[PDB]
Coordinates of C-alpha atoms in Angstrom, one line a residue:
Chain O
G1 CA 15.6 -17.1 13.1
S2 CA 18.6 -17.5 15.5
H3 CA 17.1 -14.6 17.6
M4 CA 18.5 -16.7 20.5
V5 CA 22.2 -17.1 21.2
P6 CA 24.2 -18.0 24.3
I7 CA 24.7 -15.2 26.8
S8 CA 28.4 -15.3 25.8
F9 CA 27.8 -12.1 23.9
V10 CA 26.5 -10.0 26.8
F11 CA 27.7 -11.4 30.1
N12 CA 31.3 -12.6 29.8
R13 CA 32.6 -9.0 30.2
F14 CA 33.0 -9.4 34.0
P15 CA 35.7 -12.0 35.0
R16 CA 38.2 -9.2 34.4
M17 CA 36.1 -6.0 34.7
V18 CA 35.0 -6.8 38.3
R19 CA 38.7 -7.4 39.2
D20 CA 39.8 -3.8 38.8
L21 CA 36.8 -2.5 40.8
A22 CA 38.2 -4.6 43.7
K23 CA 41.7 -3.1 43.6
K24 CA 40.5 0.6 43.5
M25 CA 38.8 0.1 46.9
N26 CA 41.2 -2.2 48.9
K27 CA 38.5 -4.8 49.5
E28 CA 39.1 -8.4 48.4
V29 CA 36.0 -9.9 46.9
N30 CA 35.8 -13.2 45.1
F31 CA 33.9 -13.4 41.8
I32 CA 32.6 -16.7 40.4
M33 CA 29.9 -16.5 37.6
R34 CA 27.6 -19.4 38.1
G35 CA 26.8 -20.0 34.4
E36 CA 27.5 -17.8 31.4
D37 CA 25.5 -19.3 28.6
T38 CA 22.0 -17.8 29.4
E39 CA 20.3 -17.7 26.0
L40 CA 18.6 -14.4 26.8
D41 CA 17.0 -12.5 23.9
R42 CA 19.6 -11.3 21.3
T43 CA 18.2 -7.7 21.3
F44 CA 19.6 -7.4 24.8
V45 CA 23.3 -7.1 23.7
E46 CA 23.2 -3.4 24.9
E47 CA 20.6 -3.2 27.7
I48 CA 21.5 -6.1 30.1
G49 CA 25.2 -6.7 29.8
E50 CA 26.4 -3.2 30.8
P51 CA 23.6 -2.6 33.4
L52 CA 25.0 -5.7 35.1
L53 CA 28.2 -3.7 35.8
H54 CA 26.4 -1.4 38.3
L55 CA 25.1 -4.4 40.3
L56 CA 28.7 -5.7 40.8
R57 CA 30.4 -2.4 41.5
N58 CA 28.6 -2.7 44.8
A59 CA 29.5 -6.4 45.2
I60 CA 33.0 -5.5 46.1
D61 CA 33.4 -1.9 47.4
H62 CA 30.0 -1.2 49.1
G63 CA 29.7 -4.7 50.6
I64 CA 32.8 -6.7 51.8
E65 CA 35.1 -5.1 54.5
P66 CA 38.9 -5.6 54.6
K67 CA 40.6 -8.3 56.7
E68 CA 40.9 -5.9 59.6
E69 CA 37.1 -5.4 59.7
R70 CA 36.2 -8.8 58.2
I71 CA 37.8 -11.3 60.5
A72 CA 36.5 -9.2 63.3
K73 CA 32.8 -9.1 62.2
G74 CA 30.8 -12.1 61.0
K75 CA 32.2 -13.0 57.6
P76 CA 35.1 -15.4 56.9
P77 CA 38.6 -14.0 56.0
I78 CA 37.4 -14.6 52.4
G79 CA 34.0 -13.8 50.8
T80 CA 32.5 -15.1 47.6
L81 CA 30.0 -13.3 45.3
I82 CA 28.3 -15.0 42.5
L83 CA 27.1 -13.5 39.2
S84 CA 24.4 -15.8 37.8
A85 CA 21.9 -15.8 34.9
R86 CA 19.0 -18.2 34.2
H87 CA 15.4 -18.5 32.9
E88 CA 12.4 -18.5 35.1
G89 CA 9.4 -19.1 32.9
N90 CA 9.6 -16.3 30.3
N91 CA 12.1 -14.0 32.0
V92 CA 15.9 -14.1 31.9
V93 CA 17.1 -13.6 35.5
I94 CA 20.8 -12.6 35.2
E95 CA 21.1 -11.8 38.9
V96 CA 24.0 -10.3 40.8
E97 CA 25.1 -10.5 44.4
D98 CA 28.0 -10.4 47.0
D99 CA 28.5 -10.6 50.7
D100 CA 19.4 6.9 39.8
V101 CA 20.5 6.9 36.1
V102 CA 21.2 3.1 36.2
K103 CA 17.5 2.6 37.3
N104 CA 16.7 3.2 33.6
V105 CA 19.8 1.7 31.8
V106 CA 18.2 -1.7 32.4
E107 CA 14.6 -0.6 32.5
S108 CA 15.0 0.6 28.9
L109 CA 14.6 -2.9 27.4
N110 CA 12.6 -4.5 30.3
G111 CA 14.3 -4.7 33.7
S112 CA 14.5 -2.9 37.1
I113 CA 17.7 -3.5 39.1
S114 CA 16.9 -3.2 42.8
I115 CA 18.9 -3.6 46.0
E116 CA 17.9 -6.1 48.8
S117 CA 20.1 -6.9 51.8
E118 CA 20.5 -7.7 55.5
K119 CA 23.2 -7.6 58.1
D120 CA 26.6 -9.4 57.6
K121 CA 25.4 -11.4 54.6
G122 CA 25.7 -8.9 51.7
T123 CA 23.3 -7.3 49.2
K124 CA 21.4 -9.1 46.4
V125 CA 20.7 -7.7 42.9
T126 CA 18.3 -9.1 40.2
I127 CA 17.0 -7.7 36.9
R128 CA 14.0 -8.8 34.8
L129 CA 14.4 -9.3 31.0
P130 CA 12.0 -11.6 29.2
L131 CA 13.7 -14.3 27.0
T132 CA 10.6 -15.4 25.3
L133 CA 10.3 -14.0 21.9
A134 CA 8.2 -16.3 19.9
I135 CA 4.6 -17.8 20.1
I136 CA 1.2 -16.0 20.6
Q137 CA -2.1 -17.7 19.8
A138 CA -4.3 -14.8 18.7
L139 CA -7.7 -14.3 17.1
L140 CA -7.4 -12.4 13.9
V141 CA -10.4 -10.1 13.3
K142 CA -11.2 -7.6 10.6
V143 CA -13.0 -4.2 10.5
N144 CA -13.1 -2.5 7.1
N145 CA -9.8 -4.1 6.1
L146 CA -8.2 -3.5 9.5
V147 CA -6.8 -6.7 10.9
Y148 CA -6.8 -6.6 14.7
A149 CA -5.5 -9.6 16.7
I150 CA -7.0 -10.6 19.9
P151 CA -4.9 -12.3 22.6
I152 CA -6.3 -15.9 22.6
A153 CA -5.6 -16.6 26.2
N154 CA -8.0 -13.7 26.9
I155 CA -10.9 -14.9 24.8
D156 CA -13.6 -17.1 26.3
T157 CA -15.9 -17.8 23.4
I158 CA -17.0 -16.6 20.1
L159 CA -20.8 -16.5 19.8
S160 CA -22.9 -14.9 16.9
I161 CA -25.8 -12.9 18.2
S162 CA -28.6 -11.1 16.3
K163 CA -29.3 -7.4 16.5
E164 CA -32.3 -8.4 18.5
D165 CA -30.9 -9.9 21.7
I166 CA -29.4 -6.6 22.6
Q167 CA -31.3 -4.9 25.5
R168 CA -29.9 -1.4 26.3
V169 CA -29.9 -0.4 29.9
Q170 CA -28.6 2.4 32.1
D171 CA -26.4 3.2 29.2
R172 CA -24.1 0.6 27.6
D173 CA -25.9 -2.1 25.5
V174 CA -26.0 -5.7 26.7
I175 CA -27.0 -9.4 26.0
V176 CA -28.4 -12.0 28.4
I177 CA -26.4 -15.2 28.0
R178 CA -26.6 -18.1 30.4
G179 CA -28.3 -15.9 32.9
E180 CA -25.3 -13.6 32.9
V181 CA -25.2 -10.2 31.5
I182 CA -22.4 -9.1 29.1
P183 CA -21.8 -5.4 28.2
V184 CA -21.7 -5.7 24.4
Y185 CA -19.4 -3.2 22.6
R186 CA -18.9 -2.4 18.9
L187 CA -15.2 -2.6 18.1
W188 CA -15.3 -0.1 15.3
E189 CA -16.7 2.3 17.8
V190 CA -14.3 2.2 20.7
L191 CA -11.7 2.5 18.0
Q192 CA -13.5 5.3 16.2
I193 CA -13.9 4.1 12.6
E194 CA -16.3 5.0 9.8
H195 CA -18.5 1.9 10.0
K196 CA -21.3 1.0 7.6
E197 CA -24.1 0.8 10.1
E198 CA -24.8 -2.6 11.5
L199 CA -25.3 -5.9 9.6
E200 CA -28.2 -8.1 10.6
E201 CA -26.6 -11.0 12.7
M202 CA -23.3 -9.7 13.9
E203 CA -20.5 -11.9 15.3
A204 CA -19.3 -11.1 18.8
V205 CA -16.2 -12.2 20.7
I206 CA -16.4 -12.5 24.5
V207 CA -13.2 -11.5 26.1
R208 CA -12.2 -12.1 29.8
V209 CA -10.8 -9.3 32.0
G210 CA -9.9 -9.2 35.6
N211 CA -13.0 -10.8 37.2
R212 CA -15.5 -9.9 34.5
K213 CA -15.8 -10.1 30.7
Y214 CA -17.4 -7.9 28.0
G215 CA -18.5 -8.7 24.5
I216 CA -16.7 -7.3 21.4
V217 CA -18.7 -7.1 18.1
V218 CA -16.6 -7.0 15.0
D219 CA -16.9 -6.7 11.3
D220 CA -15.6 -9.9 9.8
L221 CA -13.6 -12.8 11.3
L222 CA -10.4 -13.7 9.5
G223 CA -8.8 -16.6 11.4
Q224 CA -6.7 -17.5 14.4
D225 CA -3.0 -17.6 13.9
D226 CA 0.4 -17.2 15.6
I227 CA 1.7 -13.7 15.1
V228 CA 4.8 -11.8 15.9
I229 CA 3.8 -9.1 18.4
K230 CA 6.3 -6.2 18.5
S231 CA 6.3 -2.9 20.5
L232 CA 5.4 -0.2 18.0
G233 CA 7.6 2.6 19.1
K234 CA 6.8 5.1 21.8
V235 CA 5.0 7.4 19.4
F236 CA 1.9 5.4 20.6
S237 CA 2.6 5.1 24.3
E238 CA -0.4 7.3 24.8
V239 CA -2.8 5.1 22.9
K240 CA -3.8 2.8 25.8
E241 CA -6.4 1.3 23.4
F242 CA -3.7 -1.1 22.3
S243 CA -0.6 -3.1 23.1
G244 CA 1.5 -3.6 20.0
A245 CA 1.0 -4.2 16.3
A246 CA 2.5 -7.1 14.2
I247 CA 3.3 -8.0 10.6
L248 CA 1.2 -10.9 9.4
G249 CA 2.1 -13.3 6.6
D250 CA 1.1 -11.7 3.3
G251 CA 2.8 -8.6 4.8
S252 CA -0.3 -6.9 6.2
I253 CA 0.2 -5.1 9.5
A254 CA -2.2 -6.1 12.4
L255 CA -2.5 -4.4 15.7
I256 CA -3.3 -6.4 18.9
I257 CA -6.3 -5.4 20.9
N258 CA -5.1 -5.2 24.5
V259 CA -8.3 -6.6 26.0
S260 CA -8.0 -4.5 29.1
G261 CA -7.4 -1.4 27.0
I262 CA -11.0 -0.8 26.0
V263 CA -13.8 0.8 28.0
Chain B
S1 CA 11.0 0.9 -52.0
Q2 CA 7.8 -0.5 -50.5
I3 CA 8.2 -4.3 -51.0
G4 CA 11.8 -3.6 -50.7
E5 CA 11.5 -0.6 -48.4
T6 CA 9.8 -3.0 -46.0
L7 CA 12.9 -5.1 -46.0
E8 CA 15.0 -2.0 -45.9
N9 CA 12.9 -1.4 -42.9
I10 CA 12.5 -4.8 -41.1
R11 CA 16.3 -5.2 -41.3
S12 CA 16.5 -1.6 -40.2
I13 CA 14.3 -2.7 -37.2
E14 CA 15.8 -6.1 -36.6
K15 CA 19.5 -5.0 -36.2
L16 CA 18.0 -2.5 -33.8
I17 CA 15.3 -4.5 -32.1
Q18 CA 18.0 -7.1 -31.6
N19 CA 20.0 -4.4 -29.9
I20 CA 17.3 -3.9 -27.3
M21 CA 17.1 -7.8 -27.3
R22 CA 20.8 -7.6 -26.3
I23 CA 20.4 -5.1 -23.5
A24 CA 17.6 -7.3 -22.1
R25 CA 20.2 -10.0 -21.6
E26 CA 23.0 -7.7 -20.3
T27 CA 20.6 -6.1 -17.7
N28 CA 19.2 -9.5 -17.0
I29 CA 22.5 -10.2 -15.2
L30 CA 24.3 -6.8 -14.9
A31 CA 21.7 -6.2 -12.2
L32 CA 20.6 -9.7 -11.2
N33 CA 24.2 -10.6 -10.4
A34 CA 24.5 -7.3 -8.5
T35 CA 21.5 -8.1 -6.2
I36 CA 22.0 -11.8 -5.7
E37 CA 25.6 -10.7 -4.7
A38 CA 24.8 -7.4 -3.1
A39 CA 24.3 -9.3 0.1
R40 CA 28.1 -9.0 0.8
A41 CA 28.8 -5.3 1.6
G42 CA 27.3 -3.2 4.4
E43 CA 23.9 -3.9 6.0
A44 CA 22.4 -1.9 3.1
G45 CA 22.7 -5.2 1.2
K46 CA 19.1 -6.0 1.8
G47 CA 18.2 -2.4 0.9
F48 CA 20.2 -2.3 -2.3
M49 CA 19.3 -5.7 -3.6
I50 CA 15.7 -4.6 -3.9
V51 CA 16.3 -1.2 -5.5
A52 CA 18.4 -3.1 -8.0
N53 CA 15.6 -5.7 -8.5
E54 CA 13.0 -3.2 -9.9
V55 CA 15.7 -2.0 -12.3
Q56 CA 15.1 -5.2 -14.2
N57 CA 11.4 -5.7 -13.6
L58 CA 10.3 -2.4 -15.3
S59 CA 13.2 -2.9 -17.7
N60 CA 12.2 -6.3 -19.2
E61 CA 8.9 -4.7 -19.9
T62 CA 10.8 -3.0 -22.8
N63 CA 11.3 -6.3 -24.7
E64 CA 7.8 -7.4 -23.7
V65 CA 6.5 -4.6 -26.0
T66 CA 9.6 -3.8 -28.0
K67 CA 9.8 -7.3 -29.3
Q68 CA 6.1 -7.1 -29.9
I69 CA 7.2 -4.6 -32.6
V70 CA 9.1 -7.1 -34.8
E71 CA 6.4 -9.7 -34.1
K72 CA 4.0 -7.5 -36.1
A73 CA 6.5 -5.5 -38.1
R74 CA 7.8 -8.8 -39.6
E75 CA 4.3 -9.4 -40.8
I76 CA 4.3 -6.1 -42.7
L77 CA 6.8 -7.6 -45.2
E78 CA 5.5 -11.1 -44.6
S79 CA 2.4 -9.6 -46.3
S80 CA 3.8 -6.7 -48.2
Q81 CA 6.8 -8.7 -49.6
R82 CA 4.1 -11.4 -50.1
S83 CA 2.0 -8.8 -51.9
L84 CA 4.8 -8.9 -54.4
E85 CA 3.0 -12.3 -54.7
Chain A
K1 CA 33.2 21.2 9.6
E2 CA 31.1 19.9 6.7
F3 CA 27.4 19.0 7.2
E4 CA 25.5 16.6 4.9
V5 CA 21.8 17.2 4.9
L6 CA 18.7 15.8 3.1
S7 CA 17.1 18.6 1.0
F8 CA 13.4 18.5 0.3
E9 CA 10.4 21.0 0.3
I10 CA 7.0 21.1 1.8
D11 CA 4.9 23.4 -0.5
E12 CA 7.4 26.2 -1.4
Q13 CA 9.1 25.6 2.0
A14 CA 12.5 24.1 2.2
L15 CA 13.7 21.9 5.0
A16 CA 16.7 19.6 5.7
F17 CA 18.5 17.6 8.4
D18 CA 21.8 15.8 8.7
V19 CA 21.9 12.4 7.1
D20 CA 23.3 11.1 10.4
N21 CA 19.8 10.2 11.4
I22 CA 18.6 8.9 8.0
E23 CA 17.8 5.3 6.8
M24 CA 16.3 5.8 3.3
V25 CA 13.4 7.2 1.4
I26 CA 10.2 5.7 0.2
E27 CA 6.9 6.7 -1.4
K28 CA 3.6 7.1 0.6
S29 CA 2.0 3.7 0.4
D30 CA -0.3 1.5 2.4
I31 CA -0.2 3.4 5.7
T32 CA -2.1 1.3 8.2
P33 CA -4.2 3.6 10.4
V34 CA -3.6 3.6 14.1
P35 CA -6.8 4.1 16.1
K36 CA -7.1 6.8 18.7
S37 CA -3.5 7.8 18.0
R38 CA -2.3 11.4 18.0
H39 CA -3.5 14.0 15.4
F40 CA 0.0 14.5 14.0
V41 CA 0.5 10.8 13.1
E42 CA -0.4 9.0 10.0
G43 CA 0.1 5.4 11.2
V44 CA 2.6 2.5 10.8
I45 CA 4.2 0.8 7.8
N46 CA 6.1 -2.5 7.3
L47 CA 9.7 -1.8 6.3
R48 CA 12.4 -4.3 6.1
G49 CA 10.2 -6.4 8.5
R50 CA 9.7 -3.9 11.3
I51 CA 6.7 -1.6 11.9
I52 CA 7.9 2.0 11.5
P53 CA 5.5 4.8 12.4
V54 CA 4.8 7.4 9.7
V55 CA 4.5 10.9 11.3
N56 CA 3.1 13.9 9.4
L57 CA 6.2 16.2 9.6
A58 CA 4.5 19.2 8.0
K59 CA 1.7 18.8 10.5
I60 CA 4.3 19.4 13.3
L61 CA 5.6 22.7 12.1
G62 CA 2.1 23.9 11.5
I63 CA 3.0 24.8 7.9
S64 CA 1.4 24.0 4.6
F65 CA 0.0 20.6 3.8
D66 CA -1.5 18.4 1.1
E67 CA -2.3 14.7 1.4
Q68 CA -1.5 14.6 -2.3
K69 CA 1.9 16.3 -2.5
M70 CA 2.9 14.1 0.4
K71 CA 4.5 11.3 -1.6
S72 CA 7.9 11.0 0.1
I73 CA 8.5 9.2 3.4
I74 CA 11.8 10.0 5.2
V75 CA 12.8 7.4 7.7
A76 CA 14.9 8.6 10.6
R77 CA 16.9 6.9 13.4
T78 CA 17.6 8.4 16.9
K79 CA 19.6 6.8 19.6
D80 CA 17.4 3.8 19.2
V81 CA 14.1 5.2 17.9
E82 CA 13.0 4.9 14.3
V83 CA 10.4 7.2 12.7
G84 CA 9.3 8.0 9.2
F85 CA 8.4 11.5 8.0
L86 CA 5.8 12.0 5.3
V87 CA 6.6 15.0 3.2
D88 CA 6.7 16.3 -0.4
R89 CA 9.3 16.1 -3.2
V90 CA 12.9 15.5 -2.3
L91 CA 16.2 17.0 -3.7
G92 CA 19.2 15.2 -2.3
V93 CA 22.6 16.0 -0.9
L94 CA 23.7 19.6 0.0
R95 CA 27.0 20.8 1.4
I96 CA 26.5 22.7 4.6
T97 CA 29.0 24.8 6.6
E98 CA 29.4 27.6 9.1
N99 CA 29.2 29.9 6.1
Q100 CA 25.8 28.9 4.9
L101 CA 24.4 29.4 8.4
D102 CA 22.5 32.6 9.2
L103 CA 21.2 32.1 12.8
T104 CA 18.3 34.3 13.7
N105 CA 16.1 32.2 16.0
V106 CA 14.2 35.4 16.9
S107 CA 12.0 35.8 13.9
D108 CA 9.4 33.0 13.7
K109 CA 7.4 30.4 15.6
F110 CA 8.4 26.9 16.7
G111 CA 11.9 27.2 18.1
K112 CA 14.0 24.4 19.5
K113 CA 12.7 22.3 16.5
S114 CA 15.1 24.0 14.1
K115 CA 18.7 24.5 14.9
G116 CA 18.9 27.3 12.4
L117 CA 18.5 28.4 8.8
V118 CA 20.9 28.1 5.9
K119 CA 20.9 29.9 2.6
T120 CA 22.1 28.8 -0.8
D121 CA 22.9 31.9 -2.9
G122 CA 19.5 33.1 -1.6
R123 CA 17.2 30.2 -0.8
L124 CA 14.7 29.0 1.8
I125 CA 16.6 25.9 3.0
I126 CA 15.8 25.6 6.7
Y127 CA 18.0 23.5 8.9
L128 CA 15.9 21.1 11.1
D129 CA 17.0 19.2 14.3
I130 CA 15.7 15.7 14.1
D131 CA 16.8 14.9 17.6
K132 CA 14.8 17.6 19.4
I133 CA 12.1 17.3 16.9
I134 CA 11.7 13.6 17.6
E135 CA 12.0 14.2 21.3
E136 CA 8.7 15.9 21.1
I137 CA 7.0 13.0 19.3
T138 CA 8.3 10.7 22.0
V139 CA 8.1 10.8 25.8
Chain G
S1 CA -6.0 -5.0 -45.2
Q2 CA -3.0 -6.3 -43.2
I3 CA -0.7 -4.0 -45.1
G4 CA -3.3 -1.3 -44.5
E5 CA -3.1 -2.8 -40.9
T6 CA 0.6 -1.9 -40.6
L7 CA -0.8 1.7 -41.1
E8 CA -1.5 1.3 -37.3
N9 CA -1.0 -2.3 -36.2
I10 CA 2.4 -1.2 -35.1
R11 CA 1.3 2.3 -34.4
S12 CA 0.0 0.9 -31.2
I13 CA 3.1 -1.1 -30.4
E14 CA 5.2 2.0 -30.8
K15 CA 3.1 4.0 -28.5
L16 CA 2.5 1.1 -26.1
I17 CA 6.2 0.6 -25.7
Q18 CA 6.7 4.4 -25.9
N19 CA 5.8 3.9 -22.2
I20 CA 9.5 3.4 -21.9
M21 CA 10.3 7.1 -22.4
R22 CA 8.3 7.4 -19.2
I23 CA 8.5 4.2 -17.1
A24 CA 12.0 3.2 -18.1
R25 CA 13.0 6.8 -17.6
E26 CA 11.3 6.7 -14.2
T27 CA 13.4 3.7 -12.8
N28 CA 16.4 5.7 -13.9
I29 CA 15.6 8.8 -12.0
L30 CA 14.4 6.9 -8.9
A31 CA 17.7 5.0 -8.9
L32 CA 19.8 8.1 -9.7
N33 CA 18.4 9.7 -6.6
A34 CA 19.2 6.6 -4.6
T35 CA 22.8 7.2 -5.8
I36 CA 22.8 10.6 -4.1
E37 CA 21.8 9.0 -0.8
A38 CA 23.7 5.7 -1.1
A39 CA 26.7 8.0 -1.5
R40 CA 26.3 10.5 1.4
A41 CA 25.6 7.3 3.4
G42 CA 29.0 5.9 4.4
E43 CA 32.1 4.3 2.7
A44 CA 32.5 0.7 4.0
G45 CA 29.6 -0.8 2.0
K46 CA 30.6 1.4 -1.0
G47 CA 29.8 -1.8 -2.9
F48 CA 26.3 -0.5 -3.4
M49 CA 27.7 2.5 -5.2
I50 CA 30.0 0.6 -7.5
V51 CA 26.7 -0.7 -9.0
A52 CA 24.4 2.2 -8.2
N53 CA 26.0 3.6 -11.3
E54 CA 25.2 0.4 -13.3
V55 CA 21.7 1.6 -14.0
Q56 CA 23.1 5.0 -14.9
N57 CA 24.5 3.2 -18.0
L58 CA 21.8 0.5 -18.3
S59 CA 19.3 3.4 -18.7
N60 CA 21.3 5.6 -21.0
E61 CA 21.6 2.3 -22.9
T62 CA 18.1 1.7 -24.0
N63 CA 18.1 5.4 -24.9
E64 CA 20.2 5.3 -28.0
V65 CA 18.5 2.0 -29.0
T66 CA 15.0 3.0 -28.3
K67 CA 15.6 6.3 -30.2
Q68 CA 16.6 4.0 -33.0
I69 CA 13.4 1.8 -33.1
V70 CA 11.3 4.9 -33.1
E71 CA 13.4 6.3 -35.9
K72 CA 13.1 3.0 -37.8
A73 CA 9.6 1.7 -37.3
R74 CA 8.6 5.2 -38.3
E75 CA 9.9 4.4 -41.8
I76 CA 7.3 1.7 -42.4
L77 CA 4.8 4.6 -42.5
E78 CA 6.8 6.5 -45.0
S79 CA 6.8 3.3 -47.0
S80 CA 3.4 1.8 -46.2
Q81 CA 2.1 5.3 -47.1
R82 CA 3.3 4.7 -50.6
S83 CA 2.2 1.1 -50.2
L84 CA -1.3 1.9 -49.1
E85 CA -1.4 3.6 -52.5

């Protein structure tokens, strides 16, 4: 829903703001923005534009030396910094360059302005703000009327096993499938919910993690769908057993099971 | 009285039930035209439009039953006045 | 100097904060439970299209409580954080000033939470501080 | 006995709609409180207040009219009481 718009609303505040920062330091420094229509996410109108002002204030003063120390170093009598902005996969890369409270100003809404450099070439700056807002194939599951989405790309297969196959071991339960052993887990348990008990043949979903994969047994299986994952505040930053909830269609809220976030 | 009282009543209920029948129409817009147009002022447009909605929903319910009065009340005479017959 | 606060009680216990950090008020509804969350949280609700967490305010000040009387959800708004507070009945506006204030932050429990305590001709209207109160729920 | 049915046929309608004194009242209060807030809110989108008062009248409206129907339909009894004779 138009959640995407040209960067003209959070990047054009430089062709005249970087000018004054060059006069208050007696150091001539060019400034040509290579592109200013980077359709980064709209919600960045206050966490990327401004933060890009602390990466340029060092592109003039703390970088290029006056003619007296310039034409006698290794840089031409005139330098040229370039303030760019593009998309590399799913991350807007509105970089900055030339020739710790701000370490959070951009890291608030994704980002982490750093400082890389060398000798007689200048310092380079680059932030990281995702510009991909929209599609996530997920597996919608239910547990006593609790819709929990499972990141599709993480799933490997959905097999229905009977409460027979299970063969407890050193502790965690397991099931022998294709010669391999999967540590089966009961979703409602790792989430601590008042479950009924255990139906006869329960449906389990095999999720892949790192180099292994465990099985996740659930109550009922709704149906895969493209949801709108959204960070559910910080009041949950502790609950590592998740990633972010989302509002389905009919209006029902559904949390996403961060696969790696479960014993 | 009675066979006449009924009339002295139905009419006494009509001119009144019609009054409610009136409001149902005034509210049907005095609020509907305030929501479908509330999306003009501050961002609270989406917040006010809904609160204004319900106003009608649980309001119409009046007529739903209120009109159910005449519907039967009119039978009173329809039968009592007919009892004259 | 004229403060506008939201008046409401929590079992014979009055509280109130400046509307500056208020969005609206709704009635306790389908509060989707958040697993392994934090004892003082109810869960999250769908409002206007976003998922706002419903905290149990009364459960923060270690005061009275009643899942039943808790029928009013107060949605707040910090610098960029949005949180709803499940509480009891609500009153409304209330003109505050340096006259109604009777600072005595040396006669109770939880401190920083409340900026002070006001009095209306002899009431129990306690002035809360959403900012510092929310700052505890966060970080 | 339809006439003897009026002895209650409407009795229900009146009490079923009587729900207004409660539900219709409800909406009113709920909104009236939303006026307190909508007010202390700001001033730019005051457009939500210029109508947050609409219900204040819409409600007090059905009042004089509803008080009328209860006053009227109640006559049928006084009459049907003689009628049932």
